[PDB]
Amino acid sequence: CSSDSRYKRQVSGDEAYLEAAPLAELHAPAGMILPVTSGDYAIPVTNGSGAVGKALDIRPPAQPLALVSGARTQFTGDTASLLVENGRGNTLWPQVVSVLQAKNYTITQRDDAGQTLTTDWVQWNRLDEDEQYRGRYQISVKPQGYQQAVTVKLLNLEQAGKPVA
Amino acid sequence: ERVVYRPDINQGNYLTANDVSKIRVGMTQQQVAYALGTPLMSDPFGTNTWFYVFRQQPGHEGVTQQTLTLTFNSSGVLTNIDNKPAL
Amino acid sequence: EVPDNPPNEIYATAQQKLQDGNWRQAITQLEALDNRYPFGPYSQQVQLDLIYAYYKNADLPLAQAAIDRFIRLNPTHPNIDYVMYMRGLTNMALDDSALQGFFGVDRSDRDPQHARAAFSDFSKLVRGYPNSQYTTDATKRLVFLKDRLAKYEYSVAEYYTERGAWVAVVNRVEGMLRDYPDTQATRDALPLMENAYRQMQMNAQAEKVAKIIAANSS
Amino acid sequence: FVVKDIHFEGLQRVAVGAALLSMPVRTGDTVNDEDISNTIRALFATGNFEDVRVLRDGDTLLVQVKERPTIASITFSGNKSVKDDMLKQNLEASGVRVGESLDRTTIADIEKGLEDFYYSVGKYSASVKAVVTPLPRNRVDLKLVFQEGVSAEIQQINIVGNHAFTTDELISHFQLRDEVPWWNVVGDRKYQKQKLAGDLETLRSYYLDRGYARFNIDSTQVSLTPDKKGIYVTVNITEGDQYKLSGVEVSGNLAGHSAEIEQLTKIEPGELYNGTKVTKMEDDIKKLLGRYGYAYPRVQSMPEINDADKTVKLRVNVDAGNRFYVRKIRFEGNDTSKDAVLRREMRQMEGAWLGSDLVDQGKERLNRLGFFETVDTDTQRVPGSPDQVDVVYKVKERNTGSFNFGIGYGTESGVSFQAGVQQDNWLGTGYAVGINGTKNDYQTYAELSVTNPYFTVDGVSLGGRLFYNDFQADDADLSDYTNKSYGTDVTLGFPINEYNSLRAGLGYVHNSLSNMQPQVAMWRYLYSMGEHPSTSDQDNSFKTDDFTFNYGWTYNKLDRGYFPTDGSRVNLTGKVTIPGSDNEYYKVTLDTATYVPIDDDHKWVVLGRTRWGYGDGLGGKEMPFYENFYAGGSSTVRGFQSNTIGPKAVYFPHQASNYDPDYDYECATQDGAKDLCKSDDAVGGNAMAVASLEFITPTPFISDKYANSVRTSFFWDMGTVWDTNWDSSQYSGYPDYSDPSNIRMSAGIALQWMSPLGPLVFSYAQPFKKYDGDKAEQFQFNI
Amino acid sequence: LFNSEEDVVKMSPLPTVENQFTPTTAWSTSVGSGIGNFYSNLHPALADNVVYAADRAGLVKALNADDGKEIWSVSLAEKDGWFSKEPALLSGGVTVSGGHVYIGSEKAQVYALNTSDGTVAWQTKVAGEALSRPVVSDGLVLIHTSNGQLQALNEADGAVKWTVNLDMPSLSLRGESAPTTAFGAAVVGGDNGRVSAVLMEQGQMIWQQRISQATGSTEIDRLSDVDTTPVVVNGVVFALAYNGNLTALDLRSGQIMWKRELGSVNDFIVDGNRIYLVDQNDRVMALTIDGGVTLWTQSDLLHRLLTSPVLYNGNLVVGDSEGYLHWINVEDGRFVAQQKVDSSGFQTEPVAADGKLLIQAKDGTVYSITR
């Protein structure tokens, strides 16, 4: 709303929790054993994971829309889940072909023998984030019978030309 | 300094002479606890000693005091009733 | 005020308001969306969007509520790491956010109510999600927060030190120790305890502390 | 058959798989004709399917389901003062809300519930109607009509079984209202069984405290009169008879304080039994023991009633418990301010015996603090020990500080403005701040004022005030009374008692006057000063540097530190000059703030406010005319204009000011208005005696939630300012302000609004008692 | 403000005013309030040209039914107590038997006055005030109180013979549950929806039968003014449930012969095989006694605040709280005469007895009506 330039992917205020120094653990002398483990400070120590502070996205996590009826909407890993319960095991494949060209996607390879395809990078973005992107996807329709699973696999996230790893 | 008014400072956490007579060395922490419960202080890393000290300042006229501690051994058995008074 | 459109369209409209950055408007659509289509497949996402937008719009009580719902609506879910993180983040910010920091005026002397809540939140995150994408940051938060918590309690001990409540001083220092043996405030609290012991004619006990200080004399 | 597959029609709110699971006949599961029926009703049992038509193509099932969801909205119309949500809560209680299915066959039940709601409300003549509007897919808008016909009314309480008291006198003590005179509107005649319940107990206590140990209530039947409104009441009681308290048989763990308990139970044998006295005494003992450390002192009286003579031996069982529960304390809601500020206000301390009085005392102090809105706590016993209770002082913090200013006339004149803002516990640091000023083309003024109420532990209220009044009456620079006034004012507040505090410090005043006005008050002062100013000229200057001693004392046993309702404060403050000044004089004043709640719940409160003062010389000297007493416009006085109350300056036959715009600013001057032209310039007096009669009233429009920060008040205000050195023989053609009989008077209403910048009091007053030279204004607006 | 906020339902008014038998009043010797707006069972009685009239707060009148001449007057206002002249505040209707006039008060008192002058033959306190007019017969004063008690007193002094707990509802659901007699048994409804027969001779329950629903969880018509006083006809009892549901049952078994459990009928009389009644909606209807079969109905006075129906001079008579009197053709079924005798308003029972028609308004109280 009203802010001093930006604030789409960051935390408010400073990064005090990163800025602050490590703690000077106490080393009591022999025989002086105090019950200093009586608190609730169950803090595990490791290098996991992600970025920190502003570098750490506080983005509302991904989950796609019900683009198709009955879609199992949920992005996980690199895949946007959109599984569909129809009536025959060859309905999503032609639906996908229609959708691909409804979206005007450029296709690298077409598995017409099966029901899958490899696409190139298509540019997309949203001003609710401080960056712009491109996505390369592997589409896989999985004829389970009346239901066909729909795998929308982000083969590569490219930040408006910068292949994100 | 040369001041008459002073908010009194109190405290608590102490045993009366009656409470002292209620117990004796050899009694366990629980035997004591059965009517004297617990102090609001022990020995952070030593033993089972209980600290029942009374303090209270009377408007710039020094401070009153009865420091009583009860040293119990590792089995919770009272070994020493240190009924220290003021100073 | 929100027109009824397809839930995908309403959602997209909310995204457009998020594009604007007008969190208030985005939220308006998101809420309307779950109020028009509460059964939408991505109503969970709407709640995530709301958690985000509420944070962005300083509506931390509502971010908190959205999280509570997410938890109850999705006891197990791939995006909980976020939700848990945000719970802590929300509560953290809820605890400390006054503009007084601008003027160099500290808040560690305010009771870390939501900060303690956040402590728990983040500790759940880092334990339950040992290496999630939010865990490093959360871990750091747990460390610093502990120090803040200590500063508060330390300040409390200082109050009693000033007051002359030597018993309280010792117990407050001891409380810090029992919680954790590590903050600088803990190192500083340590001699406050000793002082109190001398003030209580517990010199021997004071000496015990002095020995600890000697071991920690660096 | 065996279902081949299922044509999942009629879903929307229900998922394909959810329907599959709901069905007895899921794909691959054998299908009997009875199972088709079972499936039909199983799908109906989901509560989301308006219709279910399970069929099949040979053996391939298909089900022509019609969905009955989804409640998209709910509309409330005609509900009047009833909160739609309340109505919705009952709707929700029946499982109906936005996102739920709409089972239309339950509408009648819903409607019943809504009419039952009205029934419980004290209404009943009301009827409701659900209206269903369809939305895309299946969705509905549940519009609800609330035909509120008319509420019930209390008509007449009939008490039978009584023998000694008037039915009506008992009614006069009841919450219920079976008659409300226009000349005695003490409520509305509306029936509530909750009021009844209270009244039954009121009744019980009515007799209880009159000796009726055997008083009881048999039963009651409220009259339901044919018209949904005639509320009459049948009360069946047993008076019992006035038994006399013949003694008390207190025992149990009396903690060795049985003597104090005996004192608490000093009753009279043959005294009419008084169960509220008993109640009181039980609690008195609890409090007694609370003082003695006993957080949990069970007390249980037992009226050993003797029906053979109608007396009673109040046995009392007591279990005092432990003495030392005070472990540690906490505070809550202190997130806007340093916790130590609150800690220092607790008399109760940690590692201690319970001093329940100290707890309350600390809360009183916190109540008087003024940086909080509400005071509360939480004596939470720590599990596992009778020596461990933690007390969390959960309070509601208050926004403090306040910016305000006056302005105009400017734009086409020399740019000007006023400054002035309080922080009052600046950012929770504990510092009281009130800094102000004003830059004008007449004068420029600065003032600093900051106090550290607890510079050290004891309450060293380190208060410093600085000021700089570049006042020149700048219509040129001088000639119209230049008077720069600047200096120092630093004092210390002292801890004297729980309610007592002193003030002491020093003042520094350096004034620089030049070409002062031809007037009696001014000149008279200067003649007291040994100066010899001209009655016809403004060619006199005057520089002075005074050193003074400031002091005072306050009493403070009054509720909230920002809007109290019960107690009183006294504010003694005065000064006396010291050697080194250019004039030996004094000025001593005192303010009083008394609150006497009219209503026992403090809804209405008597406010007494007065101000007193007097200043004069210490021997051949005199308090300066610019230090006089002034009243009107603001401060405490309203109805009359700003500082227009008090003695008025009399000008002398002026001829040369060293600047006098051709006819303008006449001060008894050359250009018109010649001779001793007395002015309307309320120069002020050397004596003060004012009073204010204000009465707190409640606002029936603002939700209590924050109406309790708002204060309206009725008032009758009056007072006087006068000059005891007003030599009426020299003022022979003028008023006589040596006489205290100069009391001005106004009356009306005060309107305190607690804005983001604190309480802003606006008011209306009718300045009735007006004197010559007074100015007035019925509508005044203050901070 | 609030006058416009209240959604008050309008009543049907009064179609076809008649005067086929041009109605009038024999006399309007009112006496004064009376009932006022205080809902009460107090209602007039009439016999041997003695108008047994009384106001609620005080006076007891004997008026001469040749004109409305005060034969005598006394008052049940108790000269002292907790205030001054502790007003009569009568709770039950006027019952007359032998040389006594019987009235129950709101002070739980039962008075018996000398019909020739008004002398308190006796007065005795009972267990609470009455919702019903006392039924005096066979040495007993049969009483139904607001606190659900059945009491029998000695009609000669008031000695309590017994007190029995009856069909008590959630609160004081207004309605007259007066015990009627038949073959030694007392028959009475109940304000909670049951009905019973109780040995009149000793207060010994014969049988009790639940008929319908009452207020509390099944909250009914708090507006409705029914009639839990049964009309025993031969071996079948015809009565309304507290909620106005009509039922016929075996006098000696409680078995339901038939019922119209379907709406809160307010008032009713059983004219052989024509049960005349005033519906919940104050609609006039005649029903058979072999099942409530509609013979005829009239909604002209729908929602008008009608009294009970009585028969007089061959017409169906009913008045209202508006002050209007109506005469309906006993068969089908419409106006024959109509007379607004006042505006004071009637609620008490019309007394088509002693060859007369005595009615009592709120303040205009006593009127003798004719045509």
Author numbering:
A (entry chain C): 25 to 189
B (entry chain E): 24 to 110
C (entry chain D): 26 to 243
D (entry chain A): 24 to 806
E (entry chain B): 22 to 392
Can you list sentences taken from the study reporting this PDB entry?
Its core component is the Omp85-family member BamA, which contains a carboxy-terminal, membrane-embedded, 16-stranded β-barrel domain and five polypeptide transport-associated (POTRA) domains at its amino terminus, which project into the periplasm.
Here we present the cryo-EM structure of the intact BAM complex solubilized in n-dodecyl-β-D-maltopyranoside (DDM) at 4.9 Å resolution, which captures the intact complex in a ‘lateral open' conformation for the first time. The cryo-EM map contains density for an unambiguous single copy each of BamA, B, D and E, as well as the N-terminal ‘lasso' of BamC. Most notably, the β-barrel of BamA is in a ‘lateral open' conformation despite the presence of BamB in marked contrast with previous crystallographic data, which suggested an incompatibility of BamB binding with a lateral open conformation. The conformation of BamA in the EM structure is thus a hybrid between previous ‘lateral open' and ‘lateral closed' states. Interestingly, this micelle surrounds the β-barrel of BamA, encapsulating all of the hydrophobic residues that anchor the β-barrel in the lipid bilayer. The C-terminal globular domain is entirely absent from the EM density map, suggesting even greater mobility for this region of BamC.
